[PDB]
Amino acid sequence: EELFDVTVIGGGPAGLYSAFYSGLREMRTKIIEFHPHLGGKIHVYPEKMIWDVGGLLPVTGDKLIEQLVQQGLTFKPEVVLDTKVESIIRNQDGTFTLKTSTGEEHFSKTVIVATGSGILKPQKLSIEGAERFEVSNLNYTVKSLKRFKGKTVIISGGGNSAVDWANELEPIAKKVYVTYRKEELSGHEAQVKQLMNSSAECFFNTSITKLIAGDNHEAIEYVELTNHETGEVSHLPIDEVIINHGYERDITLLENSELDVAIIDNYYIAGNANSESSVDGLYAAGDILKHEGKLHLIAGAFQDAGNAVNKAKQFIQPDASEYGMHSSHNEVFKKRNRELIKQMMK
Amino acid sequence: EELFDVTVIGGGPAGLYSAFYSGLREMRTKIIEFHPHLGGKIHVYPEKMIWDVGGLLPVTGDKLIEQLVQQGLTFKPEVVLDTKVESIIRNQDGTFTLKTSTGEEHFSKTVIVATGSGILKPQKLSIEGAERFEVSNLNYTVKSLKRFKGKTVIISGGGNSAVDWANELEPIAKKVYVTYRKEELSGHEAQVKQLMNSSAECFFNTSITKLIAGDNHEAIEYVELTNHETGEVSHLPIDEVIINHGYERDITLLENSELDVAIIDNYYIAGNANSESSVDGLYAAGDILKHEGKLHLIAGAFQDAGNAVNKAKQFIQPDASEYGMHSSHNEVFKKRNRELIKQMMK
Ligand SMILES: Cc1cc2nc3c(=O)[nH]c(=O)nc-3n(C[C@H](O)[C@H](O)[C@H](O)COP(=O)(O)OP(=O)(O)OC[C@H]3O[C@@H](n4cnc5c(N)ncnc54)[C@H](O)[C@@H]3O)c2cc1C
Ligand SMILES: Cc1cc2nc3c(=O)[nH]c(=O)nc-3n(C[C@H](O)[C@H](O)[C@H](O)COP(=O)(O)OP(=O)(O)OC[C@H]3O[C@@H](n4cnc5c(N)ncnc54)[C@H](O)[C@@H]3O)c2cc1C
């Protein structure tokens, strides 16, 4: 059949390294991700420097996502993006059937749940036809600090990530505006006092009411603002717009599944130090995995993934070795290394 | 006193990441390594490509040692190189005294044992004054493939690690010689048959009996060979000499200690999923740590190290958080990020 050895639900660090290590151990591997892009929660902070991945000199999240996606695809898994896994069923023969929000079905000998803290969607701007500018200069994350160098940015919404974004764009942007719909910027008073003594201009009881494209482009050239307590309707020229109205979560995967998988605190999968859940051949890796030695770092996701994959290989092939062969000596990389070495000699 | 918070014994991946994460959590950190150079077992294979470190695109061991050492020194720990720790003593107050082969003493609130598989020294060539040529062209490891491009190398010894080197130098070197003192090349018949089908010339019952330097330099220009069954004494011009007569191990650290530490299989530290040993404030990380979920990868060294450090911080400061703050938002990196961002904006 179309029966995979290992199917990975989720495309963040845990899922990607599962796909990678599953390929290192020569299993037919699939990875299913909700978003149209792989990478996981790091898409929430692609502009920050990341210092605590073992062996990485500091990189931005954006560059880290690049490296992880490349590593996850080394063995060319079946990649199913734009797909919400809706439920997991354990068949009587012991294999698994994954049902997507479409009803489409996937089949696997083992499943590695790497859904992290779930499906995150940024809450969209409820302005008529605002999606036109998503392809240009209407953002829901700070994709990179350089993107905003010398530009004029307005941030809609307060608190959440808003105060933190403004504080890191203040020394980079030409000007930073913040518009909040309440009275006080809903952060913690530690970082809101630096925001107000510095080069950020705040508008309270205001919201964006129309995105005005250029007569020459389709980028946002001006923005219309509206006061909720006085009533004034002003216009403002900007180079970039960033929306921060929060995130929507979807964690329904395991509730919607008929599986006696043990769950901690109504969300996390109750696992052991080897990433095993209470259902045979169903493993958890990454933020979804909870056990007494779970390390709440990206570095821990790699360990969960490797432990999960190593268990899956022996579930499928009992006489398989219990540990994967070190990459430095694994012939699985012979041809790939061949070209890399040929470039190393100039 | 000179009482450190965390002292790390061993400077490989586990030790290096312990020092880093110990610095991330703002503890006075020391790291002690036997060799003149940090890096650990990766120095045994600095010429190989490493694919399975989470988030690293394939890089050589040489480059990985570079990256790990830089990360391990991020917070400028006290680095004691060229130093063998001989024993660990638990003081009455619960702190620790580490005694070096000199008798010098180090003091710590916690110890993180990251000694891997022990102190490794390559078995030296027992030829009079052969160490003169170590600084020139007599090597005991393949430091890099490019070093040997288009060169003529003689490799002494015929063990399984001898055969592996020749097979990766065959398509790079101009010519490869292999000399073994026994009758049959004591590898496994899988790669020993590949050795003989190519441009590698083997000499059996042979060993080097004198190294002949250049009259103009002091590198080895010719090498003297001797047949152990015929008796011939031939001479051979070579560019590089590589000795592979095996390694000497030193694992006496935990036998020499009067410490009630639980040891598995007469070597490993018997730990839990949080890198705790049976002695309070004494942690183990990396290849020395054994427990049911230990991952035998560099990737696992990072998890062991992080879990150990997080436990040490709470051993030293009970009210400290049990998880270290994520690097992407940790003010401890403010000044360093300041400089990096200034370079990122051109
Ligand atoms: C703001 C912030 C900063 C951080 N900074 C650091 C740092 O500096 N260093 C560090 O080590 N860690 C950091 N972390 C932690 C790090 O983000 C997590 O450890 C890591 O992202 C967890 O990886 P994961 O793959 O387990 O989960 P995730 O990264 O959340 O990946 C889950 C993926 O699976 C998808 N998914 C979920 N449910 C489904 C479904 N039903 N069907 C299909 N796909 C689904 C999601 O869309 C997502 O793409 C930070 C976290 C946050 C929130
Ligand atoms: C040939 C080979 C290839 C490998 N390839 C891979 C690969 O591709 N991927 C992968 O993930 N893993 C690989 N590994 C495994 C990897 O090398 C180990 O997982 C890793 O080195 C463990 O790190 P460590 O810091 O725990 O131990 P080590 O690397 O052994 O570090 C221990 C350090 O402590 C020092 N030390 C020991 N005793 C003392 C003492 N008493 N006083 C002071 N210092 C002391 C030692 O000199 C050494 O520097 C490979 C291993 C080998 C042997």
Numbering used by the authors:
A (entry chain B), B (entry chain A): 4 to 349
Excerpt from the publication:
To investigate if the interchange of Val to His in FNR1 and His to Val in FNR2 could explain the differences in the efficiencies of Fld or IsdG reduction, we generated cross-mutants of the two proteins, FNR1V329H and FNR2H326V. For the FNR2H326V mutant, the λmax peak is shifted to a lower wavelength, while for FNR1V329H, it is shifted to a higher wavelength. For Fld2, the turnover number using FNR1V329H as a reductase was shown to be 2-fold lower than with FNR1 and 480-fold lower than with FNR2. Comparing FNR1V329H to FNR1 as an IruO reveals that the FAD-stacking Val residue is a key structural feature important for the reduction of IsdG and breakdown of heme, as an approximately 2-fold slower rate of heme breakdown is observed using FNR1V329H as a reductase as compared to the wild-type enzyme. To investigate whether the altered reduction rates observed for the FNR2H326V and FNR1V329H mutants could be explained by their crystal structures, both structures were solved. The FNR1V329H structure is, with the exception of the mutation, highly similar to the wild-type FNR1 structure with an RMSD value of 0.2 Å. The mutation has not led to a change in the orientation of the NAD(P)H-binding domain relative to the FAD-binding domain, nor a movement of the other residues in the vicinity of the FAD cofactor. The lowered activity observed for FNR1V329H must therefore, from a structural perspective, be directly caused by the chemical properties of the single Val to His mutation, strengthening the importance of this residue for the biological function of FNR1.
Bacillus cereus (Bc) encodes three FNR paralogs, two of which have assigned distinct biological functions in bacillithiol disulfide reduction and flavodoxin (Fld) reduction. The Bc IsdG structure was solved, and IsdG-FNR1 interactions were proposed through protein–protein docking. Mutational studies and bioinformatics analyses confirmed the importance of the conserved FAD-stacking residues on the respective reaction rates, proposing a division of FNRs into four functionally unique sequence similarity clusters likely related to the nature of this residue.
